[PDB]
């Protein structure tokens, strides 16, 4: 759906509780798996010995004369011994049947646990990426003092937890693959997983539960000797400047989410391993909730109020812009507010401004999330062969106002920008249209002048100018240094209020990561990853879908001869509207926009050769109300 | 020290804690049946008036059955020793130990609250200076 | 269990770090005392 | 991978390494003497013409002596299995493993010398800047 | 032996620290590479 | 062994006293950066 909605720490904990309830639903009986195996081996040894004795008695009773009374007595003794042997064999067969019905239930439970754990972990992929970016951008050469204060006590527990989780996932995947591709072979397949379960569930000193508890202890800082790992990690992240997406609040929240979800996955692994061995079911819901609540309370009361909700652009790109008039209007419809921006410079610089409705306590509604794309954003911020004067001001609005429209106007190299903010009333989430304020630089006199000096192009901001999650902004500004010719888009988010009212008090949370995919594009299945492609159709078998002949591992459309791929997109093509056509191609392709009846090429490439993949972006216009126009590759 | 003396008061004479197989229910009847069969076979052998080779092979199978019965009886005796003369004593010792430990820990309850209050005061108002007043060498042992 | 990570080993290590039997005598008791005696802490009772 | 396949080639069918008690010398003669005595007693019992109670008590003591002999024979059989069908195979596997490991490590001998030379160059001329280019999180695992 | 201090655990930890699967991605390979590539080292062979 | 070990250890009593005096006189309030670089890898082996 192009939107990666994050349900919060509370949502992750609720999912873990659901998986716990699913695990507890599988009844394994009243005997531990180890006890069952011990009983099985004991009965097997006894049955083997009794079978040997009975065979010897039978072979010595059917050979000699054995008289009459002696034969009867030996027959009675053999009957009694065979009755004992049959009782032992019945017990052994009962054990075998119990094992043969216990193993499939365990395998099904493990498969369900793996599926639901993967579904939950899909949420934190974006947060892991953000933490990795922060780590890469971290200035560790001079911050080794702090980075050796946070990761000096949490490191052992973190390593143990990560190793246990990864090994459990790997073993569960291996068992699932083996089952997809009876009791004895199942035990031979699950022996390694059972050994891991014994290792992690061993109620001993320095156990997995020990490291799980010490992880929380180090994060909170219960002991007087140590220091809270969360607080020192927040100090490490927030100090200096980390030029990444989101503000300090978002970065520290992402770090907290990573640690919390690691703990939740560790508790899930512990519960699954306890159920796998058939041990007693102890619900870790209370202790997991206590740990997560303590960590969230520490973050809320000792970290969050001191953080800054100010986020700037991730990086800069040195470009030479243009001159003459250039007007952009990031207007949002009534009831909407701007939640983030993105400047992308791959082929043609573009500006994506995200607008959405609000759902109380500064919550961005994913249902109404939309974007506005402006082309040639480099021509607005940078000059070509003259001097550009910027009239910059921190367009800060009072708390409770949400910015709706941001306007940039570059006229005679005079970049003047204004913003409008409407009243929000967070108690009901209704953006009032009558009550608004305007912060404008259209009437300023002081400016900052930058000369292009040919090759010395200006550093246009580049990246996602947004919080770690989309949120309304109450302050927007453009900063110009005039020394290194660097332009910075700096905004202030409302993430703190939504975190305080939704996730840090254990309520429903709906956080939207800034999309890395154009969500307003009309090409259904823009990147071919979804199976059974309905929009994409092939005229024949000449052209197909290569599962590895694309970007990274993208299933790119491969065309060989007369074959072509068609996709009807005439319904969503608005008349008299400008469009951007962008595609990454390899070889000598050709892209057309046919109109079904009376086939004409509104747009056509018909050339372009490249031994490697390159991105081509062009402009297009539809004029005479097509209502029927299909893309052909 | 008093609790140590109480712990040392428990006899546990030449006994070591083992694993209760939880198989007493089946092992008891198995041992009874095997004992009956072995007794009947022993009576048959002792009655005499049998062929020498037949008597010898009956003696051999009786010896093997007695080996099986002896193994079963040894396992059952270990289970009974664990469940009758060892576990009750250990449970009584644990009850007394936890009672006296709770009685002693009742003394350190106000001081634990004072330490918790001091910790709650420290983390609310502090800075990197607290980093200079922290020990890491003691954290593993203390946590353990 | 008796090994290099035994519980008794951790007890002895805890005692040694408390009394200051480290490489450079960093006693945990003195460090914790100087941490507690900061005037920022406002709780009942004297430093003693 | 080839050495892994060679290791997996060793059968070790349903056998687990145990502790060789090193008591084979005494246990062999003890087992022989006990076997002789048990055989003589079994022959005496099987000859018949004995009192029923006397025959029954002789059978009981013969069963107990057979239990002792069976325990001794089981211990001796475990020792023989360790020393005859398990240890030679494990020693051959270890010989092959160490030969192939030495052959593979002969490849990494120039590179070890290069790393040693780099280390000898680093510690001679360096300062606290090297502190900024050191990792402590990997030292325990690497040393282990 | 399978436990929290197993040899396989140390192997996995060594691999993770090498590739940089830490809390803050401090890859040991990159740190060691930037340590080796210092011009103060005068030994045969290029940095590669 | 105990007698001869005590006889040998009698020699290093003065050196232990000197090291203790150095540790007491050490300005650890601002030298925690270095003191956490030396006693961070040697500490486990030293304790054992």
Nearest Cα residue in chain B from A216: B143
Nearest Cα residue in chain C from B139: C14
Residue A592 φ/ψ region, left for φ over 0, alpha for ψ in the -120 to 50 degree band, beta for the rest: beta
Q: Which of A205, A206, A225 sits opposite C28 (nearest CB)?
A: A225
Nearest Cα residue in chain A from D132: A141
Answer yes or no: do A195 and E2 touch at CB < 8 A: yes
Task: Write the CB contacts of A306 (distance below 8 Å, at least 6 apart in sequence).
Answer: none
Q: Which of A151, A196, A208 sits opposite E23 (nearest CB)?
A: A151
Chains within contact range of chain E (3+ C-beta pairs < 8 Å): A, D
Q: Give the number of other CB atoms < 10 A from CB of residue A281.
A: 14
Nearest chain B Cα distance for residue F42, angstroms: 11
Q: Which residues of B touch D70 (CB under 8 A)?
A: 67
Q: Which of A80, A226, A235 sits opposite B136 (nearest CB)?
A: A226
* Helix residue ranges per DSSP H, A515-630: none
* Cα A150 to Cα A232: distance, rounded to the nearest angstrom: 6
Chain centre distance of CA A177: 25
Q: Which two tokens stand for residue A156?
A: 């052992």
Answer yes or no: do D59 and B56 touch at CB < 8 A: no
Nearest chain D Cα distance for residue B34, angstroms: 14
CA torsion angle for D17, D23, D28, D31 (degrees, to 10)?
Answer: -90
| Residue with the two structure tokens 């800047």 | D129
* Cα E10 to Cα E24: distance, rounded to the nearest angstrom: 19
Q: Which of C26, C42, C43 sits opposite B135 (nearest CB)?
A: C26
A552: nearest Cα among A582, A534, A529, A533: A529
3-state percent helix, strand, coil for chain B, nearest multiple of 5: 80, 0, 20
DSSP A355: E
Q: Which two tokens stand for residue B52?
A: 């020498």
DSSP notation for C3-44: STT-HHHHHHHHHHHHHT-SSS---HHHHHHHHHT-TT---S
Helices (H) and strands (E) in chain B, counts: 6, 0
DSSP notation for A428-455: TT---SSSEEEEE-TT----EEEE--TT
* Cα A600 to Cα A592: distance, rounded to the nearest angstrom: 9
* Cα A325 to Cα A379: distance, rounded to the nearest angstrom: 9
| Residue with the two structure tokens 């900063």 | A479
Nearest chain D Cα distance for residue F16, angstroms: 27
Report whether D21 contacts D7 (CB < 8 A): no
Q: Which of D132, D136, D137 sits opposite A141 (nearest CB)?
A: D132
Q: Which two tokens stand for residue A485?
A: 């010719």
Q: Which two tokens stand for residue A610?
A: 């490249």
For D86, counting Cβ atoms within 10 Å of its Cβ (0-12 exposed, 13-18 middle, 19+ buried), the class is middle
- The overall longest dimension of chain B from CA atoms, in Å, is 100
Report whether A460 contacts A317 (CB < 8 A): yes
D-side interface with E, Cβ within 8 Å? 114, 117-118, 121-122, 125-126, 130, 133-135, 137-138, 140-142, 144
Answer yes or no: do C32 and A206 touch at CB < 8 A: no
HSE-CB of A556 using CA atoms within 13 angstroms: 16
Answer yes or no: do E14 and D138 touch at CB < 8 A: yes
Report whether A188 contacts A271 (CB < 8 A): no
* Cα D91 to Cα D17: distance, rounded to the nearest angstrom: 12
Q: Give the number of other CB atoms < 10 A from CB of residue B62.
A: 25
- In sequence order, the β-bridge partners of residue A419 are A406, A439
Coil/strand/helix, residue B124: helix
Q: Which of F24, F39, F48 sits opposite C23 (nearest CB)?
A: F39
Do at least 3 CB pairs under 8 Å connect A with C? Answer: yes
* Cα A493 to Cα A473: distance, rounded to the nearest angstrom: 4
For A605, counting Cβ atoms within 10 Å of its Cβ (0-12 exposed, 13-18 middle, 19+ buried), the class is middle
Q: Which residues of D touch E18 (CB under 8 A)?
A: 138
Residue A115: its H or E element: helix A69-121
Q: Which two tokens stand for residue A76?
A: 């009675």
* Cα A611 to Cα A588: distance, rounded to the nearest angstrom: 9
Coil/strand/helix, residue A206: coil
Q: Number of residue pairs across B and F with CB atoms under 8 Å?
A: 6
* Cα A170 to Cα A280: distance, rounded to the nearest angstrom: 25
Helix axes A8-24, A248-276, angle to 10 degrees: 0
Coil/strand/helix, residue A478: strand
Answer positive or negative: Cα dihedral of A575, A577, A582, A588.
positive
Do at least 3 CB pairs under 8 Å connect D with E? Answer: yes
Distance between the two ends of chain C, CA-based, in angstroms?
39
Answer yes or no: do F29 and B136 touch at CB < 8 A: no
Phi and psi of A611, rounded to 5°? -70, -20
* Cα A265 to Cα A196: distance, rounded to the nearest angstrom: 15
Answer yes or no: do B52 and D47 touch at CB < 8 A: yes
Nearest Cα residue in chain E from A209: E4
Nearest chain F Cα distance for residue D117, angstroms: 23
Answer yes or no: do D139 and F41 touch at CB < 8 A: yes
Nearest Cα residue in chain A from B118: A224
| Residue with the two structure tokens 């995947």 | A173
* Cα B66 to Cα D60: distance, rounded to the nearest angstrom: 9
Do at least 3 CB pairs under 8 Å connect F with C? Answer: yes
Q: Which residues of A touch E30 (CB under 8 A)?
A: none
A233: nearest Cα among A244, A223, A219: A219
Distances (CA, A) of B78 to A126, A226, B15, B17, C4: 58, 48, 10, 10, 33
Coil/strand/helix, residue A485: coil
Task: Write the CB contacts of A112 (distance below 8 Å, at least 6 apart in sequence).
Answer: A22
Residue A416: its H or E element: strand A414-423
Chain centre distance of CA A339: 20
* Cα B49 to Cα B43: distance, rounded to the nearest angstrom: 12
Q: Number of residue pairs across A and D with CB atoms under 8 Å?
A: 6
Phi and psi of F3, rounded to 5°? -60, -50
Nearest chain B Cα distance for residue D96, angstroms: 40
Answer yes or no: do C25 and F24 touch at CB < 8 A: yes
Residue from D51, D55, D59 to probe the interface with B (highest B Cβ count within 10 Å): D59
Answer yes or no: do F42 and C23 touch at CB < 8 A: yes
Report whether A419 contacts A405 (CB < 8 A): yes
* Cα D110 to Cα D98: distance, rounded to the nearest angstrom: 20
* Cα A171 to Cα A189: distance, rounded to the nearest angstrom: 10
Report whether A6 contacts A471 (CB < 8 A): no
Residues, chain D, total? 144
**β-pairing, A370-375 with A350-357?**
antiparallel
* Cα A332 to Cα A337: distance, rounded to the nearest angstrom: 6
Q: Number of residue pairs across A and F with CB atoms under 8 Å?
A: 5
Residue A425: its H or E element: none
* Cα A631 to Cα A595: distance, rounded to the nearest angstrom: 9
* Cα A226 to Cα B119: distance, rounded to the nearest angstrom: 11
**Extended strands (E) in A292-381:** 310-311, 315-319, 326-329, 336-344, 350-357, 370-375
* Cα A582 to Cα A584: distance, rounded to the nearest angstrom: 7
Q: Which residues of C touch F25 (CB under 8 A)?
A: none
* Cα A560 to Cα A221: distance, rounded to the nearest angstrom: 63
DSSP notation for D46-114: HT----HHHHHHHHHHHHHHHHHHHHHHHHHHHHHHIIIIIHHHHHHHHHHHHHHHHHHHHHTTHHHHH
Distances (CA, A) of A390 to A409, A412, A421, A443: 10, 11, 22, 12
* Cα A593 to Cα B26: distance, rounded to the nearest angstrom: 81
Helix axes A154-180, A183-201, angle to 10 degrees: 170
* Cα B113 to Cα B106: distance, rounded to the nearest angstrom: 12
Task: Write the CB contacts of A403 (distance below 8 Å, at least 6 apart in sequence).
Answer: A337, A338, A397, A419, A420, A421, A472, A473, A474, A475, A476
Phi and psi of A152, rounded to 5°? -130, -25
DSSP A514: P
Residues, chain F, total? 48
Q: Give the number of other CB atoms < 10 A from CB of residue A222.
A: 16
For B106, counting Cβ atoms within 10 Å of its Cβ (0-12 exposed, 13-18 middle, 19+ buried), the class is exposed
Report whether A526 contacts A519 (CB < 8 A): no
A382: nearest Cα among A459, A328, A454, A447: A459
Phi and psi of A478, rounded to 5°? -115, 125
Distance between the two ends of chain E, CA-based, in angstroms?
39
Q: Which two tokens stand for residue A479?
A: 């900063």
* Cα A593 to Cα A564: distance, rounded to the nearest angstrom: 13
Q: Give the number of other CB atoms < 10 A from CB of residue A328.
A: 19
Tell me which method was used to determine the 3D structure.
cryo-EM
Q: Which residues of D touch E32 (CB under 8 A)?
A: 135
* Cα A174 to Cα A164: distance, rounded to the nearest angstrom: 15
Do at least 3 CB pairs under 8 Å connect B with E? Answer: no
Tell me which long-range contacts D124-131 makes (C-beta under 8 A, separation of at least 24): D125/E40, D126/E40, D130/E35, D131/A144, D131/F37
Coil/strand/helix, residue A330: coil
Q: In what order do the strands lie in the sheet with A336-344?
A: A315-319, A458-465, A336-344, A350-357, A370-375
Report whether A349 contacts A355 (CB < 8 A): no
For B104, counting Cβ atoms within 10 Å of its Cβ (0-12 exposed, 13-18 middle, 19+ buried), the class is exposed
A255: nearest Cα among A312, A307, A299: A299
Distances (CA, A) of A208 to C29, C31, D139, E9: 30, 31, 22, 12
Q: Which value in Å is the resolution of this experimental model?
A: 2.6
Coil/strand/helix, residue A617: strand
Q: Which residues of D touch B59 (CB under 8 A)?
A: 42, 45-46, 59, 62
Phi and psi of A141, rounded to 5°? -65, -35
Distances (CA, A) of A454 to A447, A480, D17: 21, 19, 80
Answer yes or no: do A145 and F40 touch at CB < 8 A: no
B17: nearest Cα among B93, B96, B79: B79
Residue B75: its H or E element: helix B52-81
What is the three-state SS of A137-200? HCCCCCCHHHHHHHCCCHHHHHHHHHHHHHHHHHHHHHHHHHHHCCHHHHHHHHHHHHHHHHHH
CA torsion angle for A197, A203, A206, A207 (degrees, to 10)?
Answer: 20
F-side interface with C, Cβ within 8 Å? 19-20, 22-24, 26, 28, 35, 38-39, 42-43, 46-48
Q: Which two tokens stand for residue A397?
A: 């609005």
Do at least 3 CB pairs under 8 Å connect C with D? Answer: no
Nearest Cα residue in chain F from A143: F33
For A532, counting Cβ atoms within 10 Å of its Cβ (0-12 exposed, 13-18 middle, 19+ buried), the class is exposed
Q: Which two tokens stand for residue B67?
A: 């080996």
Residue A414: its H or E element: strand A414-423
Nearest Cα residue in chain C from A205: C7
């Amino acid at each position: 759906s192009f939107i990666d909605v994050f349900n919060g720490i509370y949502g992750f904990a609720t999912g873990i509780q659901d998986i716990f309830n699913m695990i507890f639903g599988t009844d394994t009986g009243d005997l531990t798996l180890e006890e069952v195996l011990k009983n099985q081996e004991l009965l097997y040894d006894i049955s083997g010995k009794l079978e040997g004795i009975s065979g010897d008695l039978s072979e010595i009773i059917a050979q000699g004369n054995l008289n009459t009374e002696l034969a009867k007595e030996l027959l009675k003794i053999a009957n009694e011994q065979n009755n004992v042997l049959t009782d032992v064999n019945n017990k052994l067969n009962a054990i075998n049947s119990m094992l043969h019905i216990y193993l499939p239930k365990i395998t099904n439970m493990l498969s369900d646990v793996m599926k639901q754990n993967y579904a939950l972990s899909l949420q934190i992929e974006y947060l892991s990426k953000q933490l990795q970016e922060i780590s890469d951008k971290l200035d560790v050469i001079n911050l080794n003092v702090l980075i050796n204060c946070t990761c000096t006590e949490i490191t052992p527990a973190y390593q143990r937890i990560k190793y246990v989780n990864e090994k459990f996932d790997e073993l569960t995947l291996a068992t699932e693959k083996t089952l997809r591709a009876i009791a004895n072979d199942t035990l031979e397949n699950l022996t390694e997983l059972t050994e891991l379960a014994k290792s992690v569930t061993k109620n001993d000193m320095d156990s997995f539960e020990f490291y799980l508890h010490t992880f929380h202890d180090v994060l909170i800082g219960n002991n007087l000797f140590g220091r809270s790992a969360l607080k020192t990690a927040a100090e490490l992240i927030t100090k200096d400047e980390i030029k990444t997406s989101g503000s300090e609040i978002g970065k520290v929240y992402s770090f907290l989410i990573v640690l919390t979800c690691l703990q939740a996955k560790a508790f899930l692994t512990l519960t699954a391993c306890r159920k796998l061995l058939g041990l007693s079911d102890i619900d870790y819901t209370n202790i997991l909730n206590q740990h997560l609540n303590d960590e969230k309370n520490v973050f809320r009361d000792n970290i969050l109020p001191t953080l800054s909700n100010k986020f700037s652009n991730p990086n800069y790109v040195k470009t030479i812009g243009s001159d003459n008039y250039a007007k952009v209007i990031l207007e949002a419809e009534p009831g909407y507010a701007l939640v983030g921006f993105e400047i992308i410079n791959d082929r043609i610089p573009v500006l994506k401004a995200y607008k959405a409705k609000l759902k109380q306590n500064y919550q961005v509604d994913h249902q109404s999330l939309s974007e506005i794309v402006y082309l040639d954003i480099d021509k607005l911020f940078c000059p070509k062969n003259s001097e550009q004067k910027y009239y910059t001001k921190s367009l800060t609005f009072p708390d409770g106002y949400v910015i709706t429209k941001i306007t940039f106007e570059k006229k005679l190299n005079n970049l003047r920008y204004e913003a409008t903010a409407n009243f929000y009333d967070p108690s009901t989430g209704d953006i009032d249209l009558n009550e608004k304020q305007v912060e404008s630089t259209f009437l300023q006199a002081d400016y900052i002048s930058i000369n292009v000096s040919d090759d010395d192009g200006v550093y246009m901001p580049l990246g996602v100018i947004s919080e770690t999650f989309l949120s309304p902004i109450n302050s927007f500004e453009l900063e110009v240094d005039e020394k290194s010719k660097i332009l910075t888009l700096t905004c202030k988010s409302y993430l703190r209020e939504y975190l305080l009212e939704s996730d840090l008090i254990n309520k429903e949370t709906s956080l939207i990561a800034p999309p890395n995919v154009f969500i307003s594009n009309i090409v259904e299945n823009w990147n071919i990853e979804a199976d059974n492609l309905e929009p994409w159709v092939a005229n024949n078998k000449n052209a197909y879908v290569d599962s590895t002949g694309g970007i990274e591992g993208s299933k790119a459309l491969f065309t060989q001869g007369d074959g072509e791929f068609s996709q009807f997109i005439g319904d969503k093509l608005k008349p008299n509207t400008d469009y951007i056509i962008q595609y990454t191609v390899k070889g000598k392709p050709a892209i057309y926009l046919k109109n079904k009846n009376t086939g004409y090429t509104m747009y056509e490439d018909t050339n372009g050769s490249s031994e490697e993949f390159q991105t081509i972006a062009v402009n297009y216009t539809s004029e005479t109300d097509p209502s029927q126009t299909h893309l052909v590759f």
